[PDB]
Structure formats: C-alpha cells, structure tokens
C-alpha cells in the first residue's frame, strides 16, 4: 500500500504547486464589451492595416483605443453591414441595429446627414493590464526593434470577440529578450558599439545579458 | 476558482493599482466621466504651429495656389514617406494604381478616383489630408505635421508614374 501512498503525495504536490502558479494569470480573458466590435471583420478579412486604428504604437508608450473619429471617416458611407457576412450565430439585423449604437455615440444622424450635438463616449473594457511599477513602452519595442504584431498579442485577426493571449507574469519578458537580438544595422546610435568589439570580440550580441536588460532599474526602476 | 470572463484573484495586491492618474482610465472629480480633459482654444505648445488657412471652397484654392512643402532633400530621399502609404491609405486608394485600392474590389462603398483624373499640387494635398473633402476625415489625428509632407511628396512620385 506503501506504494500508492507515495503515489498519492506525489500527486497532492503536483495539485498544490500547479494552483499556487497560476493565481496571478489572466490568460483567455474575455469580458463583454459594450459594442459588439469584431477584429475579424475589419483586420481579417477587409485587409485593414493594423497600425490605421492603433496609431500611438509608434510614438508614444500607450497605443491605446482608437477614438470615435476613426470611427467615422470609414462609417460616413457604411450603413448597413452585407448580405454574406451574417453567420449562423450572427444575423443581419443584429449588425444593423448595433452599427446604429456608433452612430448615437458621436451623434451622426442618418436621415440629412448631418452632426447633431449630443456625444457620450463609449467605455470599452481594458484586457490586458500591468500593476503599475512597470514601465513597458510599446514605442521603443516595435518602432526600434522590428517585431511583428501578432508575435506580442496572438493571431488577432482571427477573433470574433477580444482574448488575451499571453500570460505577462515576469518570465516571459526575461525569456524573450534571452533568445533575442538587438538591430544594430540601421542606428547610428549603435555605431560606437558595433563597430567596436567585432575587430575585439564578436559580431552580435543579444538583448538581455549583453546590453543589459536585467536590471531591476531599467524595468521597474 | 478562475473563470474567463472575469480576472482572476490576486494575493495581497500592495502595488497593483494607482494612486496617480495614468491617461485613459475613468474617474470621477473631472469635466466629463474622463480622463482626457481638452486644452483650452487659441494656445500653443512648444513645437507645433497652427494651420491658418481656413475649411473648403474658400481656404481650399488659397491653399492649392500659394503654400510650400517646407522640407530638405536629405528627408525626401529616405524610404519613410512610403511607409506612411502603406499603412494609411491603400484601404480606399491604390497601392502601386489610383483607386483600385482594397474595397472597391469588395464593393463595401464606392466612388474613390483615381490620380490621372485630378489635379493636385503638392499644397493641395496637405490640405484634404488635414481636413478630408467630403468622404474623407481628418488625419490630423494620426499623422504628425513633419509626417504630412512626407506622405505628399509620395504621392506626386505616384501621378508621375502614371
Ligand atoms: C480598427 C478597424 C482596428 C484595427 C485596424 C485594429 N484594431 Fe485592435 N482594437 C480596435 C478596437 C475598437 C478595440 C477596443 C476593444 C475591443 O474589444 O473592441 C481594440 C482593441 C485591441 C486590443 C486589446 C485592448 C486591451 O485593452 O487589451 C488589442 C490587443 C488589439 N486591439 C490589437 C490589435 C492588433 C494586433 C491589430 C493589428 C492586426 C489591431 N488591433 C488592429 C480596433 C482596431
Ligand atoms: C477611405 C476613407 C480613404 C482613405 C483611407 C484615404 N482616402 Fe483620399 N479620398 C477618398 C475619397 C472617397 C476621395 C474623393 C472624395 C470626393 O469628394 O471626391 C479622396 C480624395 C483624395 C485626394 C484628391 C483630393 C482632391 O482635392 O482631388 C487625395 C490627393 C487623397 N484623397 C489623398 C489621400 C491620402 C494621402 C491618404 C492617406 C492619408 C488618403 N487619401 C486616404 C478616400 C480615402
Ligand atoms: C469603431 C469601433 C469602428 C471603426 C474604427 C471602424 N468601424 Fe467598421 N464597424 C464598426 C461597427 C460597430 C461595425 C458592426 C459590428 C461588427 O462587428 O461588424 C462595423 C462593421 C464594419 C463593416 C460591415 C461588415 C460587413 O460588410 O458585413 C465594414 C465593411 C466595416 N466595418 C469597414 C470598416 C472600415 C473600412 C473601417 C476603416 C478602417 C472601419 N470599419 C472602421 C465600427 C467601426
Ligand atoms: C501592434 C500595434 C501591437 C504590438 C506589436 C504590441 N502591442 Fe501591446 N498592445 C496593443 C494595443 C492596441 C494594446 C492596448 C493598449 C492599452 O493601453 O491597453 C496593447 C496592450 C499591451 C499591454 C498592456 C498595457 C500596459 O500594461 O501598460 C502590454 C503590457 C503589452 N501590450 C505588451 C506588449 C509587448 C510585450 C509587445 C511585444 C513587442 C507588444 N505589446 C506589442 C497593440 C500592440
Ligand atoms: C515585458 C513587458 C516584455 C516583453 C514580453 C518583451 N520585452 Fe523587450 N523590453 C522590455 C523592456 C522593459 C525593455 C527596455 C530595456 C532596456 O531599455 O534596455 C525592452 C527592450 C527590448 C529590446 C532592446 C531595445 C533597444 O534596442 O533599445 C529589444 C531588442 C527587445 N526588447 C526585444 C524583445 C523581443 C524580441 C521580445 C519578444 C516578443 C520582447 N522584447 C518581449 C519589456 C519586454
Ligand atoms: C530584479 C530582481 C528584477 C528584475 C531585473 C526585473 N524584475 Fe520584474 N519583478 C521583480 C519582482 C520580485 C516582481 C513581482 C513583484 C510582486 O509583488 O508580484 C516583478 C514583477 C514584474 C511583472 C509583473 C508580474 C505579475 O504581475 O505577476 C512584470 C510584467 C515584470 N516584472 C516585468 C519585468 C521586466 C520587463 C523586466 C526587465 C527584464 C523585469 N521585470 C525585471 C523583480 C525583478
């Protein structure tokens, strides 16, 4: 019996540890947003860029929500949806009467075609958050390093409603910039260094270890 | 237990939330329910100038005739003006041809011309990319001032060619 009693604190350990892991993860997060917007219709399948919406990814560190002026320099000549894009969870009618929702949201009135004066902002659902003693700054880490915008985030273009994809918890940020180089090609902010230490010591180095993104005051200061 | 459609539970969360005010989040002392109160009209931060020509049919041919792209040869000849066409325009206009682009293919709204039909000067531009003639809208707030110029003196490269 001794045998299977072993067994079973084995398993008590593995069933504690597992819990105890996975308290401070929010992966496949996915609440109800006011809208029903989908990032399949507009990135997967019209081919819209993914930088027109989200255009502060380049600038500023927060690339944040698109404001409702995007929303309408598409939608002045958008009313109604298709006739084969309804599905059999999603109908016609129920994209009809919820495009109508962006329009009492700026105003736009669809019978003279004309602004009113009555706005009230739409209060989206923020998925992806970070306690704030971190400093990430998506300006830096896809303008400066070149890294593709699924490879962060997930396949967005194929996703009905929103999910986050990764889990964020403080080793997957060391364990990416492990098995990473920096672009040292193009800036001449690196000229010092690049030409430097290939006639002395070698011809590329990675992120976290060389140039030193490790270090408790550069991330959380 | 964690469920999905709601977070997921924390231990002692000492600094988790803000005390200071990051920009989008809602609150509850301000104007609006937001967080992004507006400047007040008529004053200037350091490093921007105002446009002075006024909306269409009236500021519209003052700033086709008399209005100049305030830029050097070195920023021309750099690649990055492209990079601008292929993010914010190849959804309604062409990419290499004039108003092919993606969705008239797809015949979700019609009427996009192309640039063999009208003629635009490089002033002319820089003042629907501001402003939008009648279906398009502002992209001021996507583009930057330095960046405007950079997409026009794209776009007159595409004309040519055609
Ligand atoms: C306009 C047609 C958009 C395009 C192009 C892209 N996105 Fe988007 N995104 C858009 C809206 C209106 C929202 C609001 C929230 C919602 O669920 O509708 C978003 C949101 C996101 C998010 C999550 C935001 C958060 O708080 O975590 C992500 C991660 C995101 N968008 C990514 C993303 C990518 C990778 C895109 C290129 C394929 C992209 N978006 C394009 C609208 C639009
Ligand atoms: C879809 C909403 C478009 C986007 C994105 C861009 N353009 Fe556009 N543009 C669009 C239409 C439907 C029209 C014609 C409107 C009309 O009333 O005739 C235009 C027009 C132009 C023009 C010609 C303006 C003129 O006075 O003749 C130019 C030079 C132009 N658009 C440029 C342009 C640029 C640089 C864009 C990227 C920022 C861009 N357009 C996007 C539709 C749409
Ligand atoms: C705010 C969110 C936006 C912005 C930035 C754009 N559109 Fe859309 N759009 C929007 C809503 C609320 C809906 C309906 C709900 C849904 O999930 O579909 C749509 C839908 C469309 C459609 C109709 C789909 C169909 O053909 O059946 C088209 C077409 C479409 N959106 C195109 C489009 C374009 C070209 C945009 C410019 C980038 C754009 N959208 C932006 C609201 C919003
Ligand atoms: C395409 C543009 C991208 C790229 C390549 C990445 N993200 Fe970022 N991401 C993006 C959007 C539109 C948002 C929502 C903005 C918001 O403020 O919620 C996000 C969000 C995040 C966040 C949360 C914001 C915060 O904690 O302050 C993090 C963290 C985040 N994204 C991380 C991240 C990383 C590590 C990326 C790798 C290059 C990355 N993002 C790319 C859109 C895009
Ligand atoms: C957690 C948020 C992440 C994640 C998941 C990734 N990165 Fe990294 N990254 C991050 C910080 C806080 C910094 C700044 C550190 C510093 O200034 O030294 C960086 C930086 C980089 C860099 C260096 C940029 C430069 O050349 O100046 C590179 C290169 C880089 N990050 C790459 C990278 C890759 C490929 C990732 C996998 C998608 C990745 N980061 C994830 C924070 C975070
Ligand atoms: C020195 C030790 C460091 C190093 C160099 C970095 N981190 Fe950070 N970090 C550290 C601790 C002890 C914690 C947890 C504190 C807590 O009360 O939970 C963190 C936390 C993060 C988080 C949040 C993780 C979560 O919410 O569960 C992120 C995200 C994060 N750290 C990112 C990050 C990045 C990008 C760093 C640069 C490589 C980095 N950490 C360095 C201690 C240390």
């Known amino acids: 019996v001794l ?4 067994f079973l604190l084995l398993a008590s350990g593995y069933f504690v540890y597992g819990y105890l892991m996975q308290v401070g993860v929010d992966q496949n997060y996915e609440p109800i947003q006011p809208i029903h917007y989908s990032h399949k219709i507009h990135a997967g399948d019209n081919e819209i860029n993914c930088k027109y919406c989200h255009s502060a990814a380049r600038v500023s560190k927060t690339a944040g929500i698109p404001s409702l002026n995007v929303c309408m320099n598409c939608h002045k000549n958008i009313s109604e949806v298709a006739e084969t894009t309804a599905t059999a969870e999603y109908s016609k009618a129920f994209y009809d009467a919820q495009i109508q929702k962006l329009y009492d949201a700026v105003g736009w009135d669809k019978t003279k075609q004309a602004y009113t004066g009555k706005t009230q902002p739409v209060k989206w659902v923020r998925i992806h958050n970070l306690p704030d003693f971190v400093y990430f700054n998506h300006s830096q880490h896809v303008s400066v390093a070149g890294v593709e915008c699924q490879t962060c985030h997930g396949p967005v273009q194929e996703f009905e409603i929103m999910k986050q994809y990764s889990k964020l918890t403080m080793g997957w ?14 800036n001449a902010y690196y000229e010092k260094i690049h030409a430097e230490l290939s006639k002395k010591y070698g011809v590329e180095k990675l992120t976290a270890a060389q140039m030193g993104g490790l270090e408790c005051g550069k991330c959380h200061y | 237990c964690h469920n999905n459609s709601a977070p997921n539970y924390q231990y002692f969360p000492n600094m988790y939330e803000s005390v200071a005010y990051e920009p989008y989040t809602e609150a509850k002392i301000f104007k609006g329910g937001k967080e992004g109160q507006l400047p007040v009209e008529g004053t200037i931060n350091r490093g921007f100038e105002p446009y002075e020509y006024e909306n269409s049919t009236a500021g519209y041919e003052l700033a086709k005739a008399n209005l100049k792209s305030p830029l050097t040869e070195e920023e021309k000849n750099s690649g990055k003006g492209k990079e601008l066409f292929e993010i914010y325009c190849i959804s309604c206009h062409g990419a290499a041809g004039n108003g092919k682009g993606k969705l008239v293919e797809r015949e979700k709204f019609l009427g996009v011309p192309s640039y063999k039909d009208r003629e635009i000067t490089e002033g002319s531009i820089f003042h629907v990319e501001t402003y939008g003639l009648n279906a398009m809208g502002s992209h001021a707030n996507q583009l930057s001032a330095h960046e405007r110029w950079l997409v026009a003196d794209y776009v007159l490269k595409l004309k040519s060619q055609l």
């Open chain 1, 3 to 6: 045998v299977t009693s072993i």
């Open chain 1, 173 to 186: 940020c060391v364990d990416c910039h492990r098995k990473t180089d920096v672009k040292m090609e193009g």
